[PDB]
Design a protein around this ligand. Sequence first.
Ligand SMILES: *C(=O)[C@H](CCCNC(=N)N)NC(=O)[C@H](CCCCN)NC(=O)[C@H](CCCCN)NC(=O)c1ccc2ccccc2c1
Lengths: 173, 47
Amino acid sequence: GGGVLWDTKEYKKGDTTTGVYRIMTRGLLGSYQAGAGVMVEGVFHTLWHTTKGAALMSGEGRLDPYWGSVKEDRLCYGGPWKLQHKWNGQDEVQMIVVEPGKNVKNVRTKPGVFKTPEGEIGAVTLDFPTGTSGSPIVDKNGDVIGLYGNGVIMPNGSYISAIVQGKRMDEPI
Amino acid sequence: DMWIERTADISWESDAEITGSSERVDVRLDDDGNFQLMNDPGAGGGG
Ligand SMILES: *C(=O)[C@H](CCCNC(=N)N)NC(=O)[C@H](CCCCN)NC(=O)[C@H](CCCCN)NC(=O)c1ccc2ccccc2c1
């Protein structure tokens, strides 16, 4: 389940103002936060499981999924994956926590690693509630190095999320 | 039926709270995008 380019009579493209966003939805009990994401270079990035590819409304416009991978658990709207930085495996990083029902706050942490058969992946020991996935993680220069939301629950009950990230994709050729 | 609302700038906060330990964990990533610890029920591939 890795990689796929979506199929999206035009529509008005939604607001892609740079920043961190809350992904909202309406349920049988009212509106709530499904997840979060980060808008950069006119493209919306988030984990795959937050919207599962659902079209998103932003302003008076709409944003359609462009690319996504369930295995990578990443998804972007409006264009190719734009994030192009990753943890240097040395410095501390900061998560812009977009927790449902609470104001955004930054928490810094020294990443550890997930040892994969294919190498190592930065991993932050931060435990935040369902719906926080998509929250961006940044380095000291303020660049988005990855996303929060996909990891493991250790036997001690503490949650550890990998710094979910992919490489920048080129524009369609 | 899903929308988004901007809620913050993208930036490093000098006075940000500190939390968490740096761990070294062995895992596997299945085709469904699930990380697996050795003793998790789902440890052992899956589609
Ligand atoms: C995104 O908002 C969400 C944040 C989870 C934070 N969890 C935590 N602090 N403990 N992300 C997930 O729930 C994420 C979805 C993964 C989808 C497939 N890529 N879940 C996990 O990373 C983790 C996996 C654990 C098993 C690994 N083999 N699960 C959970 O954190 C979790 C499981 C079950 C339940 C049940 C009820 C409420 C919450 C949870 C969380």
